[PDB]
Amino acid sequence: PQLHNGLDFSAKVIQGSLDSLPQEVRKFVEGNAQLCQPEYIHICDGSEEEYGRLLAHMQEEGVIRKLKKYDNCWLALTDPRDVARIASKTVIITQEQRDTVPIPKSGQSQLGRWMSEEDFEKAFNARFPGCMKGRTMYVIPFSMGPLGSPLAKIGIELTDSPYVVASMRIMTRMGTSVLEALGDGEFIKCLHSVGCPLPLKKPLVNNWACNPELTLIAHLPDRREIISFGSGYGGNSLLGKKCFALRIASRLAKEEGWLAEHMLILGITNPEGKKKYLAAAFPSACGKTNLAMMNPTLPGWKVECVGDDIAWMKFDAQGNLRAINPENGFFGVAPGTSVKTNPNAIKTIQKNTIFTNVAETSDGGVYWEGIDEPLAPGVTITSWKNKEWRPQDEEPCAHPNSRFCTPASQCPIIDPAWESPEGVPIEGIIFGGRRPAGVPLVYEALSWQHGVFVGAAMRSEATAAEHKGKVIMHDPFAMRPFFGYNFGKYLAHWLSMAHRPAAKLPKIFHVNWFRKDKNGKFLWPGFGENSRVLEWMFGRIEGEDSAKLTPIGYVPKEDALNLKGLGDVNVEELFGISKEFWEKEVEEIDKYLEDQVNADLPYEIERELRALKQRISQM
Template sequence: MLKKNEGIDIVKELGGIQTVEEAQALFEQRLDAEHLARIRRLSHPEVLIKIANAIAMCDPGRVYINTGTDADRAFIRQLALNKGEEAVLAMDGHTIHYDLKEEQGRIIDRTYYIANPDEKISSLANKILRDDARTVVREKMAGIMNGATMVVGLYIRGPVGAAASNPALEITSSAYVSHSAEILYRNAFDDFEKEVERLGHFYTNVHSEGLNRPEDLPNARVFMDRSHRTTYSFNCTYAGNTLLLKKGNHRFSVDKAVYEGKGLELAEHMFITGIDGPDGRVTWVAGAAPSGCGKTTTAMAGNHFVGDDLAQMWIDGNKSVRSINPECGIFGIVEDVNREGDPMLMDRLRNPGSEVIWSNVLIDEDGVPHWKGNGETPPTRGRNFHGPWKKGLVDSGGKEVPISHPNARCTIASSALANYSDMAEAAEGVETRVITYSGRDSDTMPPVWVAKNSAHGVVIGACIVSAATATEVGATGVKRAPWANAPFIPGALGDYMKAQFDFFGNAAIAENKRPIMAGLNYFLTHEARGGSGTKLLGEKKDVKAWLGWLERRAHGDVEAIDTPIGFIPRYEDLKPLFETLIDKAYPKELYERQFSLYIDNILARNDLQTTAYGKEENIPQLLFDVLGEQRDGLIDLKNRFGPVVTPDQLLEG
């Protein structure tokens, strides 16, 4: 069981500030008059002591208290330019940031949970004992900001006043990190202490890029102290390792939901989008997918955009599931973002009027960004994550350097998007009626299927398998990706799974408001369904039809075909949705290829999950019961119809 405030608070010990009086004395010594006046607007003892200790430990040359004004944002952006962390581009408001070419994703091998001696963490994560972490932090972070400007920001992860929002400090010497935070999160300087009092906690994040040299990367670390909800990051620049408001604090939110939520709260790696249904109805969908597996595309396929990456969920007093986005911006992968699949995002990326931070794309000689899969004629030279680039350039290993890194990103405010919904800032959140789980699955599951009940739905999430993406340094192959949240689950998987069963099966949810739970997969290939080649069996935009069907299924407007894995659509319901939602013909032959069950592939996945979870401690028996029930049903189908079962055969019974 996770214990709050267990063991030493490392930054407090290394900083040596124990009281508010000591903190105020340090502020008077280290802050200029303007920023001393700003910090004196704060009074919460724990907040002041945390900030003071970060200053004492890191020893910056200057401290800038960011209050979120336009002037503060302009200062931070200019600081990023002055330091060379960003550079201006041809389009007004656009800048480019390059991470070290060796650090183009999350450094999972150097990311650790700080653990007390008797504390269990996820079997999929690394841990370091508290005393050892203290030694490393003292060695690597003491004085690391000497001569640099420390920017202190006070943010809220979610709308002010929301039940599941989380206040967080971002303390960094990277102006790029602070600039990104200003786009992606809500600066809540004026409301911060009120929210801390209301919610009873806050997160703290301390980061320094150090000297930003390749030779320092082996010494880069990301530490997450679960007991004191404090993160430490140093000698790294990629936002996934440095903008700890994001995935670092998401981990703390997962802990909070699992160990304090009492089956009434979740923190998920999910988009949130609203789908228009008949007669003006809007149905809200939250969906999980591993990074790089289409969350942004799926979120943008909705009519009312709230978020593309993270969701805080809770059961409210009206017996419905509510969701908010902790973020207010997009840190989105741009590879394969183009006008055909992502027209609204492309509009903002290619036309003036929005602030955009680009990272690790190619910038041509005219100051215009380019990336792989944008559907445009690529330049033959420019500068990218590797340095000066021209077509045909190879790296030291003889491998051709692509025009942009597969994990190249754009950072942009959600409010810039044409389908942005004002509900993104509603403290009450959105009533969520559909939950989806997906990954890069080329050969096994159909494009969409709905769980028979909440327990089966939790198992869909537990059993995501996905091709590795470029979001993690060194990741290759196909791997299990439970709930698309596995990298961010700090505690035992069994504890997290129990929280999922408890939440979605909770009697506090009214039956007529209980979300349907579904699998979503638009990565099936031709060769996996009797054809040839690895081209997708369908198009990215088809997800609009899958979401449209789920919207109608959530309200009981359409029937479905019963299978051992859940309910799949009928052809007569999908065909008109393709015509009306995306103006596309949907032949019966394609439907049959997509929705036939390839029994042996599904059984292999079932066995993989049963074996893998069988090695974990304290996995709820309900998971194995559901997998066993599905396996028995699949074997029965195979015995009756053979290894490939068509929808028509399923209808025969």
């Protein structure tokens, strides 16, 4: 069917067969093989054999090290220039800027970053041609969600990184069964290159291929495409993790009437054996993963994990808000993780786990700040920078957002319905973040509309490449880095859920684990003690008379919370609501919503802001 042997890359296939791919999958693979000029094409099958060899190869090349203390665990240390998502290089392309972000009255939008089609075409042409020369293009067929679930979506990721392949096997469902399930159906096109064709133009740092200068993570929702160049790390390279999971999915969700959110999903069971599912949106550094796998301090209570990071939610015919975890593993922040703060994570990560940018102990174990396991005298620490490290050094031993990448199936408190194709019925949505002052331990929204306002108004003390130290910033719905489209329209979409006939709208709560006294000490012990707060939400969903009305919403009554074992807890200060603080809070929210959202702000949000101002004025 051709004049030469040009567009057929069969000769370069080293696993699988181009003939076995669906027609549109093949076109995507061969079009990008022509552009990127990889040496080989490896069609991934997801098999155990594929994985072990892939790992052994990366070991054979010094890309990863085997962690000899554990069962089949591996360490990758990156180039320090490639250590997180870079917000300024993360862009969404649409015809009109306003469909992607509201137009800010001053400075930049804090709610997204748009690039024109024209600008993106130029950027793409400056990056991808020839970018995989001398490397293998891996073809990763993957499902976001349980295979065959009506809530699941399929992608194909092309990548030149075996680290991506290994990690995507953990974090998504991938391999031949996905290609079988897909047939000729639609899929998200995911294109990734580390941007270091051979022979290398620049020196390789720490055996970690990347192109910081040209790093660009792009999303083209109208084309169903994600195109990412120059980073090998995390949400920039595992294109399911955030690019698909939140940015593309939230736009699909908008079109199709569902929700794609930065939320954990947990199941909680009381001492009577009654069970409920809760979703919670907190920003990075605010403890979704701790909550999602909680070991509850309260006797007789049980928490089970459905997911720790992404929730895809859609109302079913009965009106239940059904949530799936579209991921297959946990991509968790390592620092701060311990038997104390997260015993169930510790049990999950002892096998078949890939660690990135953590420290290594001389006996081949993992180490990081806050691990709360002292070492035997004589055991030394190699930092994530590959150097020897002593506890009194300036630098930390692990990168502060270093990660583990671990199969979800290995969590000992994994919910037996975590892969159920219909999802789990969410009865409560929880918002929260780090507020050192003013915001009490827990409150409950007065209505759905108020609850959406509470999500919209979220602020949190965030912590390096965008500012020095900790600073309180807006992070509505914990989605500030992740909106697929105009935030004002996202709020409208949330509000519209109230007009679905027979919808069983979840109760909305806001939490604050991080309130501090005058001297900077935490008022609330947190972690497993947060079961006490979950108990109250549970009772509130059951309609128990355990709430006192305040201007910000409902709070627990005096003695409504079980504080047995916690007699030193300053409840006065921890639940205190100051008129002065809240006058300032509503003024600041007003200014932020005006500046950042303006003409796209829904009426209902403006009304909730007025209502809150009014309630505060009567204090």
